[PDB]
Homo-oligomer: 337 residues x 3
């Protein structure tokens, strides 16, 4: 039996958006299988990651930490043009956990500054998956410099609950959680470096402590707060895709739940119901579906609360609508007696 002639399939070009937003897509596939075309441009850039002003040299897909969320359906082909402009200094590549073969693509996509490449793979398994740079011999340095994102491979008939009934989200957000290892001197202050090569050994030393200096959502402390808080309305169904390319996390919606959670991200499995908190292992993307029931502020965190509130792994939702006093009320407001 001969393979399909891939040139006979539809091609659709996706235009990516910056996290936590997600490029519009259809949950249930409205066409047959397609070759879904993506382009990303690698950008090495300085980023300020905390309120103190700590500035690092980040390594990004498309200018953001995390890289953007890509969305396809099961048995589509993903065709990525990966560009490493000559304004960068390092070698990069890309590994898709969604893909099969060649170290997820990394063995086929090594691009020096001034080079580009195009990789195609068939997205044979539904789920959310990490993608990340992984140059042989310097893999964790690139990943923990921010060079990771995620791809969602939807079932062609959309998401389903534990009984096989549909689950349809109204909104989707992508939270990439990044552990950074900013090198410290003996007194505990961050060091700064003149070139990437001069940074490398202390970057390795800092990583080998296994103790992040910062753990952030969307690339910085506070990034998903204030004017950039996530939003929803009461009654809205929201999917939050959450990735961590290098270290475990334990997401939690403060004031809510994960009504349906694929903690390790793979949609052929029935979701776990009614979660308070769930474990997304390092190297994984997970997804949680929730229908909001109360308005107000929520905090969405890694529930190692030190990691959340001291190291950065906390964002907010601002939710609009009516308050339900049956679900919760202050019977007696705080008072002296």
């Amino acid at each position: 039996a001969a393979p399909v002639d891939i040139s006979t399939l539809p091609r659709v070009k996706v235009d990516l958006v910056k996290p936590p937003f997600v490029h519009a897509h259809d949950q249930v596939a409205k066409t047959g299988p397609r070759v879904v075309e993506f382009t990303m441009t690698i950008e090495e850039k300085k980023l300020v990651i905390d309120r103190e002003g700590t500035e690092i040299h980040a390594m990004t897909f498309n200018g953001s930490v995390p890289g953007p969320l890509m969305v396809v359906h099961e048995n589509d082909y993903v065709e990525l043009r990966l560009i490493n402009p000559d304004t960068n200094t390092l070698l990069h590549n890309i590994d898709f956990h969604a893909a099969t073969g060649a170290l997820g693509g990394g063995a086929l996509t090594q691009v020096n500054p001034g080079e580009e490449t195009t990789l195609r793979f068939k997205a044979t398994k539904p789920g959310v998956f990490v993608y990340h740079c992984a140059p042989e011999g310097m893999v964790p340095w690139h990943v923990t410099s921010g060079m990771n994102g995620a791809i969602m491979v939807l079932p062609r008939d959309g998401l389903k609950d534990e009984k096989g009934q549909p689950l349809t989200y109204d909104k989707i957000y992508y939270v990439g959680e990044q552990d950074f290892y900013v090198p410290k001197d003996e007194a505990g202050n961050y060091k700064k470096y003149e070139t990437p090569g001069e940074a490398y050994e202390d970057a390795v030393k800092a990583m080998r402590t296994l103790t992040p200096t910062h753990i952030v959502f969307n690339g910085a402390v506070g990034a998903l707060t204030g004017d950039h808080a996530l939003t929803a309305a009461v009654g809205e169904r929201v999917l939050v895709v959450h990735s961590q390319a290098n270290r475990d996390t334990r997401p939690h919606l403060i004031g809510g739940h994960g009504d349906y959670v694929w903690a390790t991200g793979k949609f052929r499995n029935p979701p776990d119901l009614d979660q308070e908190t769930w474990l997304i292992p390092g190297g994984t993307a997970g997804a949680a579906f929730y229908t909001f029931r109360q308005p107000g502020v929520y905090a969405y965190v890694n529930h190692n609360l030190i990691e959340a509130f001291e190291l950065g792994a906390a964002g907010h939702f601002k939710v609009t609508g009516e308050w339900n006093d049956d679900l919760m009320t202050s019977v007696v407001k705080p008072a002296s007696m």
Copy 2:
């Protein structure tokens, strides 16, 4: 459609017990939905947490670390009177992971010393859940000072196995596992502090190491041993609820199993069978059901064995009854030859 008039519902007052014991309750609900009334009094107090005599300033619900286990059924209302006496010095509140809205209750329950408040919420999801103090801006300090416990929301028809058959426990225990971060000087000795404000920065520094100094059950090294070992008889069905409000744990019954385990604690999901060890993520309560088959001593641990046997995360069961040589026997006792 109008809401139910909650004043028409039965009220029942619960009288809490100190962990690891659990206030008597009925597994299968013997009434319709009720407003279940609880009272807890916050107590800041010194606690000796290890064999060396290390003394910390703990922040407790009801005088214990962990706070007591509360038990209700799905779609009961929990009505908690939370009292912060004027003998305390700090601001406190309470967040229930079982609840929906207002940061689990924390936004509605801020009490200064000399204040009290009453919160009501509907327990809409079955499972075991963490509760903890969470004052904005100093959340992990309160949690990791011991200010956390758990609530069990039973299905109205009790627990069920993976096939839908009942599971009925004979005994229940609540193991709260606490990570403490006692500040250390450069030589490695614990520091002591004159006031909570003078402690705060080094408490933050110590937490940011992400390395607990102590990890204990029921508030101290050895608390669940000796005259306070857990007990059972051969053939008894025991549910062990285990919470960790801030850091992952991996419980294990040495010499036994978790016959049915809800590792992330939520009873609408079928349990995992025959577990040796299970991962309870930080910010979660889990529950394990076991039928004892052999007498003797067991050790119940976090199976990072350093955490268990060096840092404190180990308790014991003393089990009474007949020894089964079919299940295990010494064929040849240790000997020279």
Copy 3:
């Protein structure tokens, strides 16, 4: 009702093999229940664990880290003769997480140098399980010196998928992952020690940091690479059993998946499908089944990539067969433009 007379049952002697290989066995039981006889000889020995030449004093079952994989079926009896030769210096024992009673066997198997013992237990629960030494008062020291392995208790009708259909592996490998805590001086160099007693306090100090110095597969950095890479052919079904007796891990096949994964190792549960990465809690064995679809090199890692590529937790597969360009292809090889 009287117990079975165990002397009426067949006895079969197993001859163990060194990891990552596994002693031949039948997936589906070809006999009724048997007493399966194993012998292991404890060996304390020096091991070089990294490329730098760091040499530790390891504590082994049968000369290897990990100890060999034992394989039986559900409701067989395991009868282990455990020998501690007089050439060793320490007390040892064995705890099987598969067993019920007497701290998994440890209370019955304490052997001084020059002693042996024989333990029997009934393997009543199917799954992969850790076994490890656990001498009272010095448990984590022995475990983290390498004194751990695993046992697989197969269902009598072999493995099944989430729908109850058979899963049959063609190849099985056992990856034991070991966290070592080599004591460091203040400058960060490893210390060496003249006797085990002189090592003990700093071993304890090093363990209490909770920061491994090395995390390795099969006892050393690079052990499962080069001439000792794992092998498969395209189309082959491979089961990888993975244990970690003391600390969480998150395995990942780089370029592949876990098609069916029992992350916490217990076969009465349906497997998780299509995993990218899975969490094996410390104190647990897990198992992943994969059918290879592409040839070439794969890296099998703990996907804390620092742990993998800096601390040692990485091995390789070399896979033989045809490349499938439908599944993945380089459309445009890296080039300037």
